[PDB]
Amino acid sequence: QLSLKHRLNNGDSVYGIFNSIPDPLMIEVIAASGYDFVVIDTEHVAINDETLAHLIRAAEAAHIIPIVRVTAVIDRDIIKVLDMGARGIIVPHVKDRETVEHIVKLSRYYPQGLRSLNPLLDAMEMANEHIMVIAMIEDVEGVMAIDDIAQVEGLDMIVEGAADLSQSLGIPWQTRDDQVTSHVQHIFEVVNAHGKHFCALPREDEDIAKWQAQGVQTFILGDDRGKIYRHLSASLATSKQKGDE
Amino acid sequence: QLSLKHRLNNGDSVYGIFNSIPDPLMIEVIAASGYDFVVIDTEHVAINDETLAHLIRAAEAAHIIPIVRVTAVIDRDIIKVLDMGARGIIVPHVKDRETVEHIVKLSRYYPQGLRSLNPLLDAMEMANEHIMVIAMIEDVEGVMAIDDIAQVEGLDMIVEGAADLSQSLGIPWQTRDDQVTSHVQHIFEVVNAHGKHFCALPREDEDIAKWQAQGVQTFILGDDRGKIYRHLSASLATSKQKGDE
Amino acid sequence: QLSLKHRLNNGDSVYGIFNSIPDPLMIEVIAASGYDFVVIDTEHVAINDETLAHLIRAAEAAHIIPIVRVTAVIDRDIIKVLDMGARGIIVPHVKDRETVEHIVKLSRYYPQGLRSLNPLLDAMEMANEHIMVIAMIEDVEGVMAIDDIAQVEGLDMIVEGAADLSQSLGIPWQTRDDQVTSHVQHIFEVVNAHGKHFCALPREDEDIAKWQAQGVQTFILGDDRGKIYRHLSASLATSKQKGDE
Amino acid sequence: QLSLKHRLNNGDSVYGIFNSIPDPLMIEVIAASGYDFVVIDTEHVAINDETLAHLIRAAEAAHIIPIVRVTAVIDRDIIKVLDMGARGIIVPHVKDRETVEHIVKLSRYYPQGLRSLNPLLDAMEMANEHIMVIAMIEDVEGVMAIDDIAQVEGLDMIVEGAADLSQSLGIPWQTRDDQVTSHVQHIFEVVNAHGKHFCALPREDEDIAKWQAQGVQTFILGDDRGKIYRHLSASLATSKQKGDE
Amino acid sequence: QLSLKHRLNNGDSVYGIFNSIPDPLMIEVIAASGYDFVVIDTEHVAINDETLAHLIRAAEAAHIIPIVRVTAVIDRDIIKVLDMGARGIIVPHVKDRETVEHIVKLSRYYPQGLRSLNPLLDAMEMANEHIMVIAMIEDVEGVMAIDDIAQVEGLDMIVEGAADLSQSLGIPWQTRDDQVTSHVQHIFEVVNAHGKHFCALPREDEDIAKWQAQGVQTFILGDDRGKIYRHLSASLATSKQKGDE
Amino acid sequence: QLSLKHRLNNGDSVYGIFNSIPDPLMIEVIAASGYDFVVIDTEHVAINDETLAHLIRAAEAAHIIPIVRVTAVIDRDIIKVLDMGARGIIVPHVKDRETVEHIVKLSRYYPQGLRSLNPLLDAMEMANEHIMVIAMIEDVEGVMAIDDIAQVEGLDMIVEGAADLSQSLGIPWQTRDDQVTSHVQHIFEVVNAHGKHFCALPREDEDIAKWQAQGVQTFILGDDRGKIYRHLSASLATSKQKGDE
Ligand SMILES: [Ca+2]
Ligand SMILES: [Ca+2]
Ligand SMILES: [Ca+2]
Ligand SMILES: [Ca+2]
Ligand SMILES: [Ca+2]
Ligand SMILES: [Ca+2]
Ligand SMILES: [Ca+2]
Ligand SMILES: [Ca+2]
Ligand SMILES: [Ca+2]
Ligand SMILES: [Ca+2]
Ligand SMILES: [Ca+2]
Ligand SMILES: [Ca+2]
């Protein structure tokens, strides 16, 4: 299937990573490494639409679920990105119910939305059944409106954006601050109460256990670019010390 | 300068890595990680000429020396790759003196070669002074012809290709075999006797010290794709174990 | 000229097709096949702006009129797409008069609009004279607002979108339903009353005659991708039966 | 598997088509249409290496076997094209045994060749087992040298090139001439005697039965570009006649 | 630094040009020619995001300051364009204070805005310190709202758009008209009163002196495409006359 | 027609320029400037095959004759470049008769060559009739073999390469030296004696008259990149002096 919704329906825990190096070989390396899904990032990333389409094919061929984080311009991106075969979309900076309802309208065929049309009904039904509609909650407005957001029919999942939330709170990068963690904990509790999925971005491995015990199944473990830099820089420094004795 | 030849002339040890993911962000990540040079691979890699040109610019902007491994088709590649600004070229499967002399002809302006023309003389002189002409020695023929290869004026450096050498010897991937290591040791001794540079591909960090003690200054520490897969796969497995307690 | 407006002014019937495979060879194949115009689709299609520019050049070189269906983001797309040389634009999901007036503002130079400036006046005049401004009418809102839409000075043509209209009516793909056909017939009558052009998407060849008799001159006969799949799949099935006797 | 060699080993007949429109959507349309394999053409076609890599991924994701026809420059193309994941290669204008032996050297790992190295041995073995090495026989020299060509260990299949053969015979496009057909029949008989596969390019559906009865299993049914032009041009002409009554 | 803000802080006059041919060699030619900055145009230009990223790298490698004119869709473009390394952004058709404040929000990290997060604080601070936020004033609305626009904290510079202003005034291309010049003079006086920078687009060389005497330091001298056409066309005409005696 | 051969058959003088900035807007600017032909350079230039195809379409759409200078790898390039629609090819560093005969074989259909096949005969005939086969003479070997080169049936034109010839003579860039000019004069006389066309690269406008008087009709007036740099650098220096009074 390559359906995230299907994986979650079995009781599985699933692990992903952000892709911010828009190269199909990176998608294949991530798949080879054992990830269940990859979030191809298009918000910040310099990435051509035809490149994005290539990355989704790479994901499909490599048997990893392609999830896409789109830009703010959902009236342009969502139709294109779903027609390319993204199995899920993440919309950044979701702040209110009206935006979530619009995302659903754009993402789902009748009767669940009005996704543009471009057996037919069976294919539409299957699309609606398996697509993941995911909202980033990463500013104070979104945390405050979480109860109204979480109850929108068709919204499947919320992902915590602690970094941008910290800046929204006037404490950028203080993601360990009780303010940030209490807001994230609140987001989870409300999401969970409305029978929706929460996606954690655990800082450290131990945080996975802490979340898992409360019933979280979905985990994004950082981003490729960050992990690669940290590994290559550490590895090289160690090499240069060992070489000089 | 961004000249490998200049770095070596000071007594420096220099560290590089193969790039086989043809994305400018990878070049920038490699530079950020602390590498002195990057060998952008075009032999095996699916990589457009315009992409290669972009990667060399990324290297320049990120202050890392761009070295390029070209394909077998040197009469096409060398002129293009030098005009793009590669500071060094690696030619694969160098087997005889005649090939080395042809590489030099293609890589160097008069009076050192006949590099196509496309103050003028001063620029030509500076190009010749700083370019690194590098031959891969990776088959039995090349090891056997090493004395004739190493004495070609204009050949700056030899790089060991233990993997392909092992297959040439009918023992593919037995790179730890005494046959392979003795041939590589021979290559070094002959290269060094003719006052040329040797570039090691050490298997492990300890091998850097062993080579450095014999006067080797240049080291390629694997390739990005391999390191990334090994790190991401190890990291994820550890994460999944820690999450489940 | 390669002007659709010019062709229509002679009494010609003109035939087009949607292009949803963004390759210049497809544009050339469509031109070779005898089409008068091609609607290069960018709404749903994964297509780079530089690719689109290439397709328009292919059209020009192949002597086929390039019409472009843009995305919803007209404040971005229209200026780019006209400067690339599109001879007409189709805007999707036109729902009100205010949108049509904005399209005209963006598409036409003074005195007919405020198309960005980037003999000069003569070139502007010629652009305004020959550009086709085309609105898709494909949701109930647009059909209801058709009288207000059709009378906007500078709107040249309306195209029926029966598929998306059917979903808007809560009967997706029931394009043969009397609801859908009566609305499309209404759209035509109102458009025609205001002296504007109607563009039909006939389901079958016989529908061309039916429309032509009422004075329709413009016909889009499906899309390349759909026709190709249907032909290749039918052709192959026939081949496999004939081969096995 | 997506292995042509595997399909042939079961007694299957397999059907392919040339792709000369280098767009991943065309690969997907060909797969949807029911073809078992696609021959992505790079000999004549303007196609970037990164595009080719994308087309092979499209094929994999769409569950169609990707075969690639390379250029004459096998010392460049073969290593790249195999590393991209082509399941078979077609080399044009094969004229002698020496060329076939070189193709095998480039295409197969030790002990069957010397394909560059870039469990390890198991992966090499699997590659060798499943790769199809295919020679185009399309000039008089190649037909004359067919016995020496066909007996090269590692050559899997020969494909008839009647068009270019006709020009080689000084009768370009006279592919129905007894000269051309007798030479093609000879090629088959010799290939078949040496236990190798023959690939037919039948002119018409009836030719499939004629070949199949002699034990031919592999059929290339034209090329996408040609079929599309012929269908679109015929379809449009019929539409325009029906519209005018 | 490659900081325009830094250059202006020394008392320097700085010279730029619009780039509307999106090729990295053009960026390099502009740098070689002696320009201090280049305004890479994306408003009108057909230019892929990955191409734009390449042009910015070309600028960095060639030691020319990259400034980017974005499209109207600032909620998409600004984050991408800053993360690519643009040292300044120009937003077209700035008409009110609310838009300027939004540009600042998008362009600057806390505490000066809410630029998305993607030592950390030091890097943010350095970004804010060196970025140039630039508004195009090119319609009557913007001239009328200039006092409210100019006093927005975080707006660094205004650039005159005489061409589009002339069309806004109903006199397209009458850029020499007293209406246009008096409005531009007003824009400068108000901008200058609020301690902000003005960027002139002088028609002729003599206009540079006239502006410089009033304290203007920043000058855009046309666009590459226009200059190239005018030079090549003049040069060729002269050549053809000289050849025929 | 867009046939250089046709233009020359009327008694016209024709003017071209090298394109070494591989952007379709540059092709269009060159066409707008009044050039009869453009030599799209692929020898030195970083240029994707799909880009080259785009540039040829740009040329066709802009009504300028596209001529292509290929790389040394004629067995790869010529078939691709002709199928893309180049109206002429320039092969660099032509040194002997055997190479010219091979170029002709690759460039012309039966009976004039064996150009790969990919009314039919009429199209082949028209191709042969209008294609220009052009050899660069730019090394001492080629000048020495000029009589044998010039008499090859199917070779249409020779172009002088004074720059590379000077380096071949051990006097790189001494293109004004009597050695270089006497060799170029010899090339012309021999070419002209065999009824073939000569293409001059005049240093200065006055050289056009000198060549024209001897019956030369074809002139390449430099390259875009060089002219642009020289104009932009001169123009900017003048601007900066005028601004400072
Ligand atoms: Ca899913
Ligand atoms: Ca964020
Ligand atoms: Ca160097
Ligand atoms: Ca190797
Ligand atoms: Ca038109
Ligand atoms: Ca629609
Ligand atoms: Ca196979
Ligand atoms: Ca052939
Ligand atoms: Ca700056
Ligand atoms: Ca403007
Ligand atoms: Ca010609
Ligand atoms: Ca040359």
- The CA-based dihedral angle spanning residues E206, E211, E216, E222, taken in that order and rounded to the nearest 10 degrees: -50
Instruction: Count the residues in chain D.
Output: 245
Q: What is the DSSP track for A213-235?
A: TTT--EEEEEEHHHHHHHHHHHH
**What is the rounded CA–CA span in Å between residue C108 and residue C115?**
5
Greatest alpha-carbon pair distance for chain C in Å reads 69
Q: Give, in degrees to the nearest 5, the angle at Cα A242 between A237 and B2.
A: 50
Q: Are D172 and F117 in contact (CB under 8 A)?
A: yes
**What is the rounded CA–CA span in Å between residue B180 and residue D147?**
39
Residue E87, φ and ψ in degrees, nearest 5: -90, -10
Q: What is the DSSP track for B59-110?
A: HHHTT-EEEEE--S-HHHHHHHHHHTT-SEEEESS--SHHHHHHHHHHHS-T
Q: What is the DSSP letter of D19?
A: E
Encoded tokens for A103: 């995302």
Q: What is the DSSP letter of C211?
A: H
**What is the rounded CA–CA span in Å between residue D25 and residue D2?**
19
Which of helix, strand or coil describes residue E47? coil
- How much distance in Å is there from the Cα of B60 to the middle of ligand 2? 30
Resolution, given in Å to one decimal, reads 1.9
Dump strand ranges (E) for chain A.
14-19, 37-41, 65-69, 88-91, 132-137, 157-160, 197-200, 218-223
* Closest approach of C245 to chain A, Cα-based (Å): 30
Residue D235, φ and ψ in degrees, nearest 5: -60, -50
- How much distance in Å is there from the Cα of F76 to the middle of ligand 12? 19
Q: What is the DSSP letter of A195?
A: T
**What is the rounded CA–CA span in Å between residue B195 and residue B185?**
16
Encoded tokens for A149: 């957001």
Portion 166-185 of D in contact with B at CB < 8 A: none
D193–chain A Cβ distance below 8 A for any pair: no
Sign of the C-alpha dihedral computed for residues A9, A10, A11 and A12 taken in this order: negative
Number of separate helices (H) and strands (E) present in chain A: 12, 8
B84 to chain F: closest CA residue = F46
Distance set, CA F57 to CA A75, D42, F27, F28, F202 (Å): 33, 20, 10, 10, 28
Contacts of F141 (CB under 8 A, 6+ apart): F95, F96, F168
Q: Of B110, D153, C12, nearest to F168 (Cα)? A: B110
Strands A218-223 and B132-137 turn out to be: unpaired
- Are residues A111 and C71, on separate chains, in Cβ contact within 8 Å? no
**What is the rounded CA–CA span in Å between residue B213 and residue E106?**
54
Distance set, CA E15 to CA D124, E24, E37, E119, E218 (Å): 59, 19, 6, 34, 6
Question: How would you classify residue A9: left for phi > 0, otherwise alpha for psi between -120 and 50, otherwise beta?
Answer: alpha
* Closest approach of F140 to chain E, Cα-based (Å): 29
D85 to chain A: closest CA residue = A61
Q: What is the DSSP letter of E135?
A: E
Domains and CATH numbers, chain B: 1-245 (3.20.20.60)
Contacts of B237 (CB under 8 A, 6+ apart): A34
Q: Integer distance in angstroms from the first to the last C-alpha of chain A? A: 52
**What is the rounded CA–CA span in Å between residue C240 and residue D15?**
8
Which of helix, strand or coil describes residue F192? helix
**What is the rounded CA–CA span in Å between residue B109 and residue B118?**
11
Q: Of B83, B16, B28, nearest to E57 (Cα)? A: B28
Contacts of F198 (CB under 8 A, 6+ apart): F157, F158, F159, F160, F187, F188, F191, F192, F211, F216, F218
**What is the rounded CA–CA span in Å between residue B3 and residue F13?**
47
Distance set, CA A85 to CA A20, A81, B70, D85, E204 (Å): 19, 7, 36, 22, 53
**What is the rounded CA–CA span in Å between residue D18 and residue D30?**
10
Identify all chain D residues contacting C242, using CB atoms and an 8 Å cutoff: 205-206, 208-209
Neighbours of ion ligand 10 (CB under 5 A): E 161, 164
Portion 52-71 of F in contact with C at CB < 8 A: 53-54, 57-58, 60-61
* Closest approach of A51 to chain D, Cα-based (Å): 9
- How much distance in Å is there from the Cα of E53 to the middle of ligand 10? 22
Encoded tokens for F136: 């660069």
* A-B contacts at Cβ under 8 angstroms: 114
Encoded tokens for B57: 């610019």
- How much distance in Å is there from the Cα of D136 to the middle of ligand 7? 16
- How much distance in Å is there from the Cα of E151 to the middle of ligand 9? 20
- The CA-based dihedral angle spanning residues C222, C225, C228, C232, taken in that order and rounded to the nearest 10 degrees: -140
Elucidation technique: X-ray
Say which ligand is closest to the CA of E8.
Answer: 9
Q: Of C181, C130, C132, C178, nearest to C155 (Cα)? A: C132
Q: Of E189, E137, E146, E147, nearest to E168 (Cα)? A: E137
CA B2 to mean position of chain CA atoms: 15
Q: How many alpha carbons fall within 13 Å on the CB side of residue F107?
A: 27
**What is the rounded CA–CA span in Å between residue C135 and residue C154?**
11
Identify all chain B residues contacting D53, using CB atoms and an 8 Å cutoff: 46
* Closest approach of B230 to chain D, Cα-based (Å): 14
F55 to chain C: closest CA residue = C54
* Closest approach of D115 to chain B, Cα-based (Å): 9
Q: Check whether the bond before A24 is cis (ω within 30° of 0).
A: no
Q: How many alpha carbons fall within 13 Å on the CB side of residue F203?
A: 10
Count of Cβ atoms closer than 10 Å to residue A238 Cβ:
11
- Are residues B46 and D73, on separate chains, in Cβ contact within 8 Å? no
Which of E43, E163, E170 is nearest residue C79 as measured by Cβ atoms? E43
Residue E223, φ and ψ in degrees, nearest 5: -135, 150
Contacts of D234 (CB under 8 A, 6+ apart): none
- How much distance in Å is there from the Cα of F152 to the middle of ligand 11? 18
Encoded tokens for C62: 């192949």
Q: Provide, for chain B, the percentages of residues in helix, strand and coil under a 3-state DSSP scheme, each rounded to the nearest 5.
A: 50, 15, 35
Q: Are E177 and E163 in contact (CB under 8 A)?
A: no
* Buried-exposed string C189-219: b where 16+ CB fall within 10 A, e elsewhere: ebbbeeebbbbbbbeeeebbeebbeeebbbb
Q: Check whether the bond before F111 is cis (ω within 30° of 0).
A: yes
* Closest approach of B125 to chain D, Cα-based (Å): 31
Q: What is the DSSP track for C115-169?
A: -----HHHHHHHHHHH-EEEEEE-SHHHHHTHHHHHTSTT--EEEE-HHHHHHHT
Portion 103-142 of A in contact with C at CB < 8 A: 109-111, 114, 116-118, 120-121, 124
